Each structure stands twice: as C-alpha cells, then as structure tokens.
C-alpha cells in the first residue's frame, strides 16, 4: 500500500507491507500506514500514471 | 545543542518546540517516525531528544 498526500507542499509518501492468507482481494483487516518517507517538493501535481 | 538538565525547571527547546518544565525519563516506547508524546487534552507529555 502506497497512500499519498499533498498538503502545504509536503508531498508525503506513506507505505505498509503486510502479508495475508488471501490471494483474491483485499481482506477484512486493518493496517495503519506509517510515513515511510516525506518529500518536501512543494510542487503542483494533479495526475499520475 | 548546549546541554540537557533534568528534574529542574528549565526552558527546553527541541527542534522548535518550546516549553518550561522538568524532564523526567520514562519507560514509554515510541515509533521511529514519532517524535513527541501527547495527552488526552492536547497536552505535551513526552519529547524524545
């Protein structure tokens, strides 16, 4: 999981790596995402690929 | 960084967070990204130097 954000020019890049006993879809679990890195780029972004 | 003194009322400033009080070592545990603690009433209660 790679939650992203862009507030106050603080382009945060979260992450979380959790293995589960499922190979079909997202499970009925719950895992918080720690701010692995933070990128103070302060640019305007509106699209990605 | 000049000094660190404990158990006596001083003016502590950690990276920008300012405040007056006594610094007491505790057995609490943080997370690597987490910096300073907090109470149930928006009260600062711990700061990892």
């Amino acid at each position: 999981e790679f939650v992203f954000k862009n507030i106050d020019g603080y382009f945060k890049i979260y992450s979380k790596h959790t293995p589960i006993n499922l190979v079909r879809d997202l499970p009925q679990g719950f895992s918080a995402l720690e701010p692995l890195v933070d990128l103070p780029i302060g640019i305007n972004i509106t699209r990605f690929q | 960084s000049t000094n660190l003194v404990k158990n006596k009322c001083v003016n502590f400033n950690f990276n920008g967070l300012t405040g007056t009080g006594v610094l007491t070592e505790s057995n609490k545990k943080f997370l690597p990204f987490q910096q300073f603690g907090r109470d149930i009433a928006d009260t600062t209660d711990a700061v990892r130097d």
Binding site: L26, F30, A32, L33, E34 | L31, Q34, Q35, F36
Partner: peptide, 17 residues
C-alpha cells in the same frame, strides 16, 4: 473492475505521538 476497500487508507496524520 471494482472492489470494496473496506477500512483501507487509515494512516498516521501526524508524527505526534
């Protein structure tokens, strides 16, 4: 094509402990 992200996207809003 679509699925249910049940309780996903709950991170730490701050480095405050």
């Amino acid at each position: 094509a679509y699925t249910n992200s049940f309780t996903r996207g709950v991170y730490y809003p701050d480095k405050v402990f």
